[PDB]
Amino acid sequence: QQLNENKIIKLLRDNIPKLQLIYLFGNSDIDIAVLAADTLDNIARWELAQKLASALDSDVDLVDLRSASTVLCQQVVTQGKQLWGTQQDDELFAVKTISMYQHLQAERQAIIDDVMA
Amino acid sequence: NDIIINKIATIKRCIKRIQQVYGDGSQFKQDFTLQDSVILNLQRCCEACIDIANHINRQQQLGIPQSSRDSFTLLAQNNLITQPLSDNLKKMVGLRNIAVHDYQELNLDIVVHVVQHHLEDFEQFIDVIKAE
Amino acid sequence: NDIIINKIATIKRCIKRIQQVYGDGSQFKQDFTLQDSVILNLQRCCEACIDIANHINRQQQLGIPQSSRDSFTLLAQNNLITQPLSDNLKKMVGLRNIAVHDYQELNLDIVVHVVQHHLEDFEQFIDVIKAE
Amino acid sequence: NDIIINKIATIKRCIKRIQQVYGDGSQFKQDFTLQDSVILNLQRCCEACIDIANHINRQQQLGIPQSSRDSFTLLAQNNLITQPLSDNLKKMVGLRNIAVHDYQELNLDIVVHVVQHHLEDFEQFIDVIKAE
């Protein structure tokens, strides 16, 4: 398992320029999230996900924490293990996501109340 | 509906405030109070647009929003607003999140360009939603 | 903590901005621009306090709050800040929401009273978090 | 919980998509594109139901589901759903596998029967999970 983590870390670092954070969350797909100084190209992001999946012999979802939704970032913050990156960036991203998720929960409360009877 | 009317009036008032306070824009980079007023009224416009979009999504059960930007995506893929207008409103939502959540140094040139070229998007959104 | 340091610096700058723009308060209820500036800086103070509360809650593994007021509630339940300070900060959050989202008629007298008597709550929160 | 909300919203979206693309059914058995859309959205409904069932089995610690059908058996054993509803969801389980491949001559009648008689089962699962 730890050997699998190193493959993920090095594969992401060797293909993502100016990479800042690598989180691992989630026999099906391996759930990886990344934050860099830029937003990954959608097609290129999926291509890197498929490269990771072929290297690990298991499905892989690569989450761009710069373009992903607030709910997904909140899930990654709440359960994701940080594989790579400084703790300062981790704390910054965590507090950003928590504050934005609180404001969003304030925003979308009526819709959730309506759809859930 | 009445909530949509109130939020449309709020957007119009905030746009008038932005246009009145900005002036010719010479003293913007110099007066911090002017910048504060313009930023707050832009944020208010974004909040009112988000509230309108969320009320419409709740009225028609278009789904739940995954983010503040998503509140307009759920409109775009329902053929209620055009993709360029949706993308511009999502740009406004990104600016608003930058302003209030402070996860990046706020860029004043972006603010000037949005004031000069993106309030038209708020008025287009008013036009589109008014004929509900 | 560098994040706490930067957030405290933001709160201090915004407190100074509120105090300077308000001045003696003779033109406050007459000039909407000063009102907008003070509202925006109060929002900045509130958001920075909310971010600090969320950071401290995640750091000490006290729980991830669903609302911004729940973060101050957690800080109080864990005896990190006092209940009166927690209630004061949560009512400041309520004032910010009133002023920004406009779900009730904004009372400028409350903004004046907060400028006169309630910035000390931000100062006290800074001094309590500083001596962690 | 956000997972359950999103999965319920996805089931609702896919049921609306099925009901819209199918229409009255006069053009369905003639156009293969409508059949493809209906098959895909039915499989999406079934997969989302299985996901909700597995998440509830893991949440309330009802047991370790040996299969995707056993995930509904765990819900039925603890009287969270009725046995007829569990058996109908198990019916839907076989729908996704059968409709993957392109034996059109058999599955067409089966897909029509499912669209006519088994969307109420998805809605009923949505309703009974909603009460949690």
Author numbering:
A (entry chain A): 2 to 27, 37 to 127
B (entry chain C), C (entry chain B), D (entry chain D): 2 to 133
Task: Share the article's original sentences.
We determined the crystal structures of HepT/MntA and HepTY104A/MntA at 3.08 and 2.6 Å, respectively. There were four molecules composed of one MntA polypeptide and three HepT polypeptides in one asymmetric unit (ASU), and the complex formed a hetero-octamer based on symmetry analysis; this result is consistent with our previous report. During structure determination, three regions of the unambiguous electron map connected to the hydroxyl group of Y104 in HepT were exclusively observed in the structure of WT HepT/MntA. In view of the above mentioned results, antitoxin MntA polyadenylylates toxin HepT, and in the final structure, a total of three AMP moieties linked by 3′-5′ phosphodiester bonds were accommodated in every region of the additional electron density map. Y104 of HepT was polyadenylylated, and a phosphodiester bond was formed by the α-phosphate of the first AMP (AMP1) and the hydroxyl group of Y104. Interestingly, detailed analysis of the AMP triplet moieties of the three HepT molecules in the ASU revealed that the orientation on Chains A or B was different from the one on Chain C. For clarity, the polyadenylylated structures of chain A of HepT and chain C of HepT were extracted. The AMP moiety in Chain A was twisted toward the cleft formed by α4 and α5 of HepT. In contrast, the AMP moieties in chain C of HepT were oriented to MntA. The analysis of the interaction of HepT and the AMP moieties revealed that AMP fits near the cavities along the cleft access to the RX4H RNase activity site. Furthermore, the highly conserved R70 that was located in the positively charged region of HepT forms hydrogen bonds with the first AMP moiety.
